[PDB]
Amino acid sequence: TVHEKRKLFPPSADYPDLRKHNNCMAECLTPAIYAKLRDKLTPNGYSLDQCIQTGVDNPGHPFIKTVGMVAGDEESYEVFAEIFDPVIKARHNGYDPRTMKHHTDLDASKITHGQFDERYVLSSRVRTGRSIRGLSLPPACSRAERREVENVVVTALAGLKGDLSGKYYSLTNMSERDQQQLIDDHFLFDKPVSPLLTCAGMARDWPDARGIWHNNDKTFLVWINEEDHTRVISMEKGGNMKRVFERFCRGLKEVERLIKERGWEFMWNERLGYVLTCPSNLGTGLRAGVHVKLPRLSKDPRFPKILENLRLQKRGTGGVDTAAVADVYDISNLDRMGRSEVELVQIVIDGVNYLVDCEKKLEKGQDIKVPPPLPQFGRK
Amino acid sequence: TVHEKRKLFPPSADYPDLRKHNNCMAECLTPAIYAKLRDKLTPNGYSLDQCIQTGVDNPGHPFIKTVGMVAGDEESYEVFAEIFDPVIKARHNGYDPRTMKHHTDLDASKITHGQFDERYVLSSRVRTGRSIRGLSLPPACSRAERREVENVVVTALAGLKGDLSGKYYSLTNMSERDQQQLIDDHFLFDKPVSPLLTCAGMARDWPDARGIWHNNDKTFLVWINEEDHTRVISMEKGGNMKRVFERFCRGLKEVERLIKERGWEFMWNERLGYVLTCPSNLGTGLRAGVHVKLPRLSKDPRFPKILENLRLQKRGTGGVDTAAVADVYDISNLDRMGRSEVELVQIVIDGVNYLVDCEKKLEKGQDIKVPPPLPQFGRK
Amino acid sequence: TVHEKRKLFPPSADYPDLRKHNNCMAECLTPAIYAKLRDKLTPNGYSLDQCIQTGVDNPGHPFIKTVGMVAGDEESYEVFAEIFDPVIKARHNGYDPRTMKHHTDLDASKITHGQFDERYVLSSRVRTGRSIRGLSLPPACSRAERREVENVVVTALAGLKGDLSGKYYSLTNMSERDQQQLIDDHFLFDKPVSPLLTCAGMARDWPDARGIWHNNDKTFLVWINEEDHTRVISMEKGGNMKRVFERFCRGLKEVERLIKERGWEFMWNERLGYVLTCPSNLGTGLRAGVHVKLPRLSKDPRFPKILENLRLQKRGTGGVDTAAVADVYDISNLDRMGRSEVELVQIVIDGVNYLVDCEKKLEKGQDIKVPPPLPQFGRK
Amino acid sequence: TVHEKRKLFPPSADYPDLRKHNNCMAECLTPAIYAKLRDKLTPNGYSLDQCIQTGVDNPGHPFIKTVGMVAGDEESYEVFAEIFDPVIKARHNGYDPRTMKHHTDLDASKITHGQFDERYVLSSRVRTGRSIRGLSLPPACSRAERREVENVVVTALAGLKGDLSGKYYSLTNMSERDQQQLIDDHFLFDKPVSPLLTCAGMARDWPDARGIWHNNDKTFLVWINEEDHTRVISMEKGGNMKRVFERFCRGLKEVERLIKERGWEFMWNERLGYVLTCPSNLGTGLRAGVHVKLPRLSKDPRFPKILENLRLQKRGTGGVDTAAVADVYDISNLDRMGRSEVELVQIVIDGVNYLVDCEKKLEKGQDIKVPPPLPQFGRK
Amino acid sequence: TVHEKRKLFPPSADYPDLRKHNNCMAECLTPAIYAKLRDKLTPNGYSLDQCIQTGVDNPGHPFIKTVGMVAGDEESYEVFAEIFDPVIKARHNGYDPRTMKHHTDLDASKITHGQFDERYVLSSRVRTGRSIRGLSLPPACSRAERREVENVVVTALAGLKGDLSGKYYSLTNMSERDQQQLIDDHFLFDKPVSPLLTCAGMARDWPDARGIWHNNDKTFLVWINEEDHTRVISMEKGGNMKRVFERFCRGLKEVERLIKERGWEFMWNERLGYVLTCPSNLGTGLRAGVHVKLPRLSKDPRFPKILENLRLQKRGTGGVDTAAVADVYDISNLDRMGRSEVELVQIVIDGVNYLVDCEKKLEKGQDIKVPPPLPQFGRK
Structure with a gap:
């Protein structure tokens, strides 16, 4: 050795x-x-x-x-x-x-229905990461490797067409107009600051070979070379989760198609699922989530235990607007490795719907309850 | 190769x-x-x-x-x-x-006199860095190497005696009392924040194997494993520069004596002088300087050119007190590699004295002038 | 490794x-x-x-x-x-x-109905290729290796005697006399032109170390170093297929005898049979075939399916038909790896005989039929 | 090693x-x-x-x-x-x-008489080639290396601006229109056929990573990955040779500028000049020439010796279609290694002008002569 | 490697x-x-x-x-x-x-009744070879290795005592006197002449590090470095085979004892027995034989088949000559590997006794017979 x-x-x-x-x-x-x-x-x-x-x-x-x-x-x-x-x-x-294996499931069809109450759910998002096999991950990758990741992925994306076509913006040389525009859309990122990342050498040579690509009507985001080879994101306003997922799976299958055409694969193995740079994102690398308005259930002291039982986690909105972060929450799937991508998206569909229903209940006075907790693992 | x-x-x-x-x-x-x-x-x-x-x-x-x-x-x-x-x-x-070689000169005796006007010069300081040969510098050194530097240097210092004896404080396990006390004395440092340093990997494993040692009456400071194997400092209140230097050379010769006794040397070579981790500190690694009160010459627009000609550089005090940073300056030697350690300390002696004399002049109305510029190199 | x-x-x-x-x-x-x-x-x-x-x-x-x-x-x-x-x-x-193994069988004392009706069967040919173990195949072989193949094989052939003795013509320095003569006999080949071959580096150093050898009455051809170490043809006029085969097996056994005598073997392994440079000619490398005159069955639209079922193929002289109402075809065995050399030659014997019989049928008005299709594999 | x-x-x-x-x-x-x-x-x-x-x-x-x-x-x-x-x-x-060294000189200011009489001098052009250092030449380069050459050069060219900006067409994916249009302009090339090239492995993987780039008004051609990393061409109608050269040197200096910016150099050494894949194109790789109409001097039997003495050569380039008219000639510089790029272009300027003058002479009856032969080498 | x-x-x-x-x-x-x-x-x-x-x-x-x-x-x-x-x-x-293993057994006890007719048998002997492990055999051994074999074996022999003590003579400088004396005793050998041996490189550096050792009353011979590391010989006049063997086993066990004491072993393995340089002398390396006078049975044409059945072998006494009769016979064991050393010596005991008995029979007129043939292998 x-x-x-x-x-x-x-x-x-x-x-x-x-x-x-x-x-x-x-x-x-x-x-x-x-x-x-x-x-x-x-x-x-x-x-x-x-x-x-x-x-x-x-x-x-x-x-x-x-x-x-x-x-x-x-x-x-x-x-x-x-x-x-x-x-x-x-x-x-x-x-x-x-001891365990991991099953990947990107058949959106299995999600027969996922529509949220657009009075409460302000928006819906599904993200994940993909790593190009053969090139080192960000903590390690040399400039040339990093450059190659950008080159492989951008060519791939450039061959997307239909509702999945869009354009690519290079952090290294973009006009002040492109910059602000991407800031308003909330598509921009820049040099990591968390010592968790920067002390892992993920900010070297910034901004060389990073960039943002999104489809033309801004419902498919791909961030190239940030804290992972790619972070692919499907997000939409409203609460048509099933459609958001249907495109996520569609863009992910067409991208993999086009990289395999030029000879590259995604890193994936059966015991870890989709290999990514941080252990916490193995398996599915998936975060399906919604911006819910939940003022009543928020104040109820059974919120946390309902959340915990539904295997959802709650975080802050942060970036404000007429989107008053005060009312709004970031409820997303807790698991990452137990379950398939379908299984996890359904968990969010059901759990969020329940959450919405409980908010309604508490509006009409009548009291809610705490659902019996989901198993930590999935099927098969 | x-x-x-x-x-x-x-x-x-x-x-x-x-x-x-x-x-x-x-x-x-x-x-x-x-x-x-x-x-x-x-x-x-x-x-x-x-x-x-x-x-x-x-x-x-x-x-x-x-x-x-x-x-x-x-x-x-x-x-x-x-x-x-x-x-x-x-x-x-x-x-x-x-093409050039570099001469090291640590014979304080050659500095026959260096006393500053204690009405203007508030304090006097001579610092430098030493690197232990055989162990990697901070951008690279493994924990074990870093630990060994601390072990070699601390044992050495522990055998200093007389006015050069003192004690050692380990950043990793020191009481809140030791902490604040070292803060009041202004001997403490901690994890670098400048991306110039931290992006060069000089903050890894903090605070493991860093520490401060100073002699008992706080006129000899040694910082172990900060941004260099050692930064040795002789500083004193007032303006008895010759004495400050006489101890600097004395502690530096006794430390080198005791490490050579156990088998270690300082990194030094004839074309670079004393090897240290940043190219800008090669040769002498020396910064001899004074806190001057210079309100008149400060306002005169010939200050910069006098400074430049005297081969001195001016920076800010920063940390305040009855030491009102407003009036006080940090005038130190500009050169690092041209000249010997003696040559450089004399440059500060002469240049500061002139600076003081010019302040006096402008107080008594009578006007100053700009001295003819020193050569950038030294003798031999 | x-x-x-x-x-x-x-x-x-x-x-x-x-x-x-x-x-x-x-x-x-x-x-x-x-x-x-x-x-x-x-x-x-x-x-x-x-x-x-x-x-x-x-x-x-x-x-x-x-x-x-x-x-x-x-x-x-x-x-x-x-x-x-x-x-x-x-x-x-x-x-x-x-998953499968391959059986070689050079015993002509097995093949039966080996005379065709020379009314209908005009010539009979049987070719295969042999590669000398220890020397690289043509896409790769250095001039020295190529030279050695020629040396090993020519010495071997030179020790053939009887009806199997003949002479060798080096393409290198060859009289226009011997040139034209070999052109009239149709024994000559020269530099490949198909990009399939030439782009595989099979035309390097032409014509160095290539040559033709044939027995004295021109019924045994060996081509040295063309598109394979050797390609040994037994061909005869008429339709005495059994005799053509009986000599093919005889020359192949005597050549192998004489190379083994000087220490060389043929490349052969149990899962691939006789190793040759192009995957398509693995197993037997065998092409047993006949020039048939088949005008009636030619026009019948059951020809193709009879052919397919009999496991033969038509490569009629001049494309696959021609501008010829001559109606003379190159009906040869389809398989190459399923079956042994004997099994394949018998397939041509039976299939051609049937083909001839069907031609006769359609001459006497009475109609033919399509035989039940052979299995794609052989015995053992 | x-x-x-x-x-x-x-x-x-x-x-x-x-x-x-x-x-x-x-x-x-x-x-x-x-x-x-x-x-x-x-x-x-x-x-x-x-x-x-x-x-x-x-x-x-x-x-x-x-x-x-x-x-x-x-x-x-x-x-x-x-x-x-x-x-x-x-x-x-x-x-x-x-024993000798080679001097390169792309100062197109230095040329003088570059304004040929445009009623005999139809065409002017000047081609050299450049090879990217660090990547293998065409006989050897792997697909990945070949790809990289295309990537380095195309990016470079894409940053040309002014009269030197234009566009790039990839052999792999260019439209039927892109194709014919480039055929009419006479900018297109395709898979080599000369056994001199193809037998040297210069046609592998065709047309992968080949392409044509030209500036917008079609006076600067760059062929990527044909029979050399780049074959760069400045050509113009008429006979303003000095201008043709002034742009050749200008595009060559701006391209080298932009590749050096991203970190790549041109292969060049002092004893061989600009390294290219065929030994005959060493030194300058330069081919400055004109299409002249020269019917009188053409028939004179002192043409060859004037040519030889002037260090030019003649050819008749293109296709059967147009060879109809034997009034015109491709007169270009003979040398390639003796002299600098300037020296060689001046040789064509002078030699062609003389050639034109001789044609005029023979029109007005009065007889020409054979000029005293140029030295085979240049200055310095 | x-x-x-x-x-x-x-x-x-x-x-x-x-x-x-x-x-x-x-x-x-x-x-x-x-x-x-x-x-x-x-x-x-x-x-x-x-x-x-x-x-x-x-x-x-x-x-x-x-x-x-x-x-x-x-x-x-x-x-x-x-x-x-x-x-x-x-x-x-x-x-x-x-597939087989080999059993060694030098227990002479098992040889019980082994006394020959001393009116027919004149001499009896058993020889073998032993090879010292760690040093190359004669075809290969360097001079230093050969020297070491002599040194190991001679020291060993020098520690033999009793009837097994004797002296050592070195061919390298063996005086005239000792030479002839060893010739008369028939103990001398010299440079091999058989191309079988000399063409196997067994005569190199002759006579360096060869020598003869024998016990004081000339019944135990050891030849050092002839055609094997050692050839060890117990021979006696008369026909007391059991005693001859009892000493052979005794000297062989005491020699192995004394080499093991200084750290050396005999080469031996379970599938080959005692490893020696020629494959024919593997297993036992043993040759037990007698010089019989057999004039009657000699002339009988059933001699050969009796011999063959008894697993004996005829060797006309003719290497050293000593006024021999046409009736003196070297009859020795045929086998070397099937059987143990005991088994083989008994084969000679029985077979020779039978041979003697048959000679007696034919003297007294009465006719002999051919015994039923021994199995080619032994027990266990």
């Missing part, structure tokens, strides 16, 4: 001081695993030390724990499995890549 | 986009140098790409240019000389490590 | 654009197979890229289905099996080298 | 039979050179055998100088200098890369 | 011409075995070609069993088993080292 020059000191002399740390990496690393893995390199030379760095640099918090490590390349998940497999099992409470 | 796995793409495909950059690295890098050096590694494996990263990530500014690269290890200056030698020649306007 | 520092780009960047291609190679190649195999070399250094080149250079036309790749050496079939095995299974509709 | 040791036979067993050959390769190869070089590889693995192949396959004809070998990569000229240096010296009658 | 660029021509080009050969090597070698084994080396570098050389050089004659090959070192039997295993099975008609 391939070995580090890091043969310099006894590996234990290189052990991190993780005493005050609470992240899944620190929580799962042991003197023995560290010693065993220190000088094992991936084919391209990513090292265990580089995986775990952000987790050593960022002690995190007790209440919200973070993963604490990162994959430089696809082989990282395999070369350093002896530390990734536990971290994954911890982060996706239960799912054990050692 | 030793080679990178980075054989992946043609090196030119890996060339940085330095179009909007103004730092000495961007200014001096060329397609040919890049191609020639990309896959050359140092003995421990530092790569040209890691040297130049901060300079690629930080476009800098036209008015104040920065160096734009960094040395991971001592061999970096030699392995990648074809890009360091120009950058050095540019930053130390003139000094060409290819 | 197998690899190559062709690692110059990621392999996918090297994927052929096979979008407008219809050949068995293009039809079966996949981004994954390509990526897996690109940098695997054969013992002598043949590369997957060289195998598939002709197939990349020659897209095709949906009419004629072609193979689209080639074997440089014997190890190619094994090293790049992951693409050869499917291509073989496709070309020899069904035969799967992964 | 790269060494084939094919060593499947002692190298002499691999010597080509060049007995009936007349090309500069055959003329200069010797048993000893062959044996010395056979198993030496270039960094990327080009072999002497691949260099000389076309020359082995194409004995050529004793009337026309043909070189007989080819360079797979830039290193070929250096690794196999022991056979290239003589071939070059023979080809460019005299110029010896071993 | 254990692999050579004897990869120079294809191994088949190196195949011996064994057409006119009849030795067990030629009889068993095949193009395939040769090709497979040519470039496999033993740990010390013995090659298949060196094994089989004598057999290529000496065709033999079609009735005498010559092996045709030789082992350079112990590993030869293992590295080149694919040719040795058949040769062994052929030589020792039946015994197959692949």
Whole structure:
């Protein structure tokens, strides 16, 4: 097997001081695993030390724990499995890549109906990440590799047509008009600032080879080379979730078609699903969610337990407008690895609908209840 | 010679986009140098790409240019000389490590007199950096290497005695009392924030193996493992510069004595002088300076040209008190590589004295003048 | 183990654009197979890229289905099996080298009704190809290797005696006398022109080390170093197929005897049979056929289905028909890998006899029929 | 450090039979050179055998100088200098890369009489070629390398602006209209047919990554990936040679500017000048010429000797269709390595003007003469 | 490595011409075995070609069993088993080292009644070879290895005491006196002359490190470094075979004791028994035999078949001559590998006794018979 020059000191002399740390990496690393893995390199030379760095640099918090490590390349998940497999099992409470397999399901047809009450649901969004096989992930990828990801994906997207055609904007050389316009649409991103990311080397050479592409009527977003090879997003106003999903699956199948045509594949394997740079997004990499207006259920102290039981999670809107963040919430699927992409989108469909129904109930006085909790895993 | 796995793409495909950059690295890098050096590694494996990263990530500014690269290890200056030698020649306007040699002079005796007017000079300071040979510099050093630097230097310091004895405080485990006390004395530092440093990987594993040591009457400071293996500082209140220097040289000679006793040396070579991690601090690594109160000369529009001619540079005080930063300036030596440590300290002695004399002149009405400019280089 | 520092780009960047291609190679190649195999070399250094080149250079036309790749050496079939095995299974509709074995049977003392009605059967030919083990096939073989093939085979042939003795003509320095004579006999060949062959590098160094050998009464032809190490023809006028075959097997057994005597073997393995440079001629490499005069059955619209059922094919002299009311066809065996050499020759014996009988039938008015179709495979 | 040791036979067993050959390769190869070089590889693995192949396959004809070998990569000229240096010296009658240096000079200001009498001088054009450093030349370059050449050059060209802006047409996907239009303009090329080229492997993977780019008013042509990385052409109607050259130098300087900006250089060295794939096009790669109408001087039997003395050559280029009119001639510079690009263009300016003047003379009866012959080399 | 660029021509080009050969090597070698084994080396570098050389050089004659090959070192039997295993099975008609094991038994007790008619038998002897493990056999052993065999064995013998003590004579400088004395005793040997041996490189550096040792009353002979590391000989006058054997086993056990004491072992393995340099002397290496006077049975034409059935073998006493009768006979055991050392000595005891009894019979007129043939193998 391939070995580090890091043969310099006894590996234990290189052990991190993780005493005050609470992240899944620190929580799962042991003197023995560290010693065993220190000088094992991936084919391209990513090292265990580089995986775990952000987790050593960022002690995190007790209440919200973070993963604490990162994959430089696809082989990282395999070369350093002896530390990734536990971290994954911890982060996706239960799912054990050692023993379980993962089923991908992108047949929108199976979602026969998903329409939300447009009086409460202000908008609907489905995102995921895809990684191009053969090029290193962002913590590691050289400029040339990063450039190639942009080149592969942009050519692919440029061959999309119909409602899925659109244009590409290069962060490196775009006019002030393009800039502001993308700011108003809320399609723009820029250099990461979270030490969780930047301390994992994901902000190198900014903004070289990053860019935004969206279809012409702004319902399909692809972010190239941000915190992952691609983040693909289907979002729409209103609450026609089934249509949002139907396009997500459609653009994802047509993009994969066109990259395979020129010879490239997506990284995917049966025990991890769709390989992405952060362990927390393995499996489906999917976040289906809605902007709900939920003032009554919001104040009820059974909100959290209903949420928890429905396997949904709630976060803030943040960016305001006539969209008064005060009333509005960001309710999305909690799971990522247990279930298929269909299974997860249906979870959001049902859970959100219930949430809406409970808001209605509490408006008409009559009281709601807490539904019996979903299983953490899916079928098959 | 030793080679990178980075054989992946043609090196030119890996060339940085330095179009909007103004730092000495961007200014001096060329397609040919890049191609020639990309896959050359140092003995421990530092790569040209890691040297130049901060300079690629930080476009800098036209008015104040920065160096734009960094040395991971001592061999970096030699392995990648074809890009360091120009950058050095540019930053130390003139000094060409290819053609010139550098003389170190730590004989305080040669400074027969340096007393400042304690009505104007509020305090006097001489700092420099030393790097322990055999362990990688901060951009590169593994935790174990970083730990060893701390271990070598602290043992050394612990054998200092007399007015040079003191104690060591470990950033990783110090009481809130020690903390605040070091804050009041102004001896404390913590995790770098400048992207110039942090994007060069100098903040990894913070605060592991960093610490402050100072002598018992707080006139000799050593910072271990901050932005260099050691930053040694002799500072005193008032203006007895000659005494400040006499101790600086004394502590520096006794420390080198004690590390050589256990088998370690300082990195030093004849064309670069004292090797440190940032090219701008080669040669002497020395900053001798004073906090002057200079209200009259400050307002005179001949201040800058007197400064420039005296080879001094002026910066801000910043941290205030009864020390009202408004009146007070930070006048220090401009050069770093042309001259010896003695030569440079004398430059500050003379230049500051002149500066003080000019302030006096303008108080008594009578007008000052601009002295004829010093040569950029020293003797021998 | 197998690899190559062709690692110059990621392999996918090297994927052929096979979008407008219809050949068995293009039809079966996949981004994954390509990526897996690109940098695997054969013992002598043949590369997957060289195998598939002709197939990349020659897209095709949906009419004629072609193979689209080639074997440089014997190890190619094994090293790049992951693409050869499917291509073989496709070309020899069904035969799967992964799962099946192949039986060779050169015993003419088995073949029965081997005289045709010379009224109708005008000539009888039987050809196959043999490759000398230890030397590279024509797409790859260096001049020295090519020379050695000629040397091994010519010495062997020179020791044939009886009705199997004859002489050898080197294409290199050959009299216009011997040239024209070989043209009249129709024994001559020269530099390939089909881009299928020439783009596979089979015309290099022409005519070095090529030559024709035939027995003294011109019923045994051996072509040395044309589009295969050897191609041995037994052909005779008339229709005594059994005798034609009896000599084919006799010359093939005596040649193999004499090469084994000097230490050389024929390339042969149990899952592929007799290894030759083009996948389509694997197994038996055998083409037993007859020039028949078949004017009646020719016009009948049951000809094709009788042919198909009898497992034969028409390549009538001059395209496949011609501007000829001559009605003389090149009816030959369809299969090449299912069956043994004996099995295949008997297929032609029976099928041709039936064909002749049907012609007779339609002459005497009385109508023919379509025989029940042969199985695609043989015994054992 | 790269060494084939094919060593499947002692190298002499691999010597080509060049007995009936007349090309500069055959003329200069010797048993000893062959044996010395056979198993030496270039960094990327080009072999002497691949260099000389076309020359082995194409004995050529004793009337026309043909070189007989080819360079797979830039290193070929250096690794196999022991056979290239003589071939070059023979080809460019005299110029010896071993002993001489070559001066490039694209200062088109320097030219003077570039305004031919536009009633005989129909056409003016000037073509050179450029090769991108870091990527293999056409005989060798993998699809990925070939793709990269197209990518580097097209981006470069896309940043040309002014009279030098235009558009790019890809052989792979250009419309029926794009096609015929480029045929009428006479900008189109397609798959080489000369065995001199195709037998050197310059037609592989056709038409992948080839394309035509021209400026908007069709006076600057760039052919990408035909028989060289780029073949760049400035041509104009009429006879304003100085202007044609002024743009040639202008486009060549702006293209080199824009590739250097992204990190790529042109292959060039001091003893060979601008490295290109065929030895005959070394030095300047330049071909400045005019379509002249010269009916009188054409019939005079001093034409050839005037031509020879003036260092020009004549051809009649294109197709049967137009060869109807033998009034016109393609008179171009003979040299390619002796002189600089300026020196050579001036040679055509002077020589053509003289040629025109002689035509005039013979019209007015009065007789011409043969000018005293130019030296074969240039200045410096 | 254990692999050579004897990869120079294809191994088949190196195949011996064994057409006119009849030795067990030629009889068993095949193009395939040769090709497979040519470039496999033993740990010390013995090659298949060196094994089989004598057999290529000496065709033999079609009735005498010559092996045709030789082992350079112990590993030869293992590295080149694919040719040795058949040769062994052929030589020792039946015994197959692949499938069978071999039992050694030097317990002379088991030899109970072994006293011959001392009026017919004049002499009795048993010899064997032993090879010292760790040093190469004679075809291969360097002078230093050969020297070491002599040193190990001589020291061992020098520690023999009792009736087994004696002295050692070195051919390198053995005085006139000792020479003739050893000639009269018939203990002397000198440089081999048989091309079977000398063409196997067994006569190199003669007589360096050869020598004779015998016990003081000349009943135990050891020949050092002749055609095997040791040849050990117990011989006595008369016919007390049991005593001859009792000492053979006694000296063999005491010698092995004393070499094991200094750290050396005898080469022995379970499928071949006692490894020696010629395949024919594997197993027991044993030759127990007697000089019989047999004039009557000699003339009887049932002698041969009695011999054959008894597993004996006739050897006309004729190497050293001593006024011999036409009735003195060397009758010895035929087998070497089937049976144990005890089993074989008993075979000679019984068979010779029978032979003697038959001579007696024919003296007293009364007729003998042919005993029913022994099985070719032994027990266990």
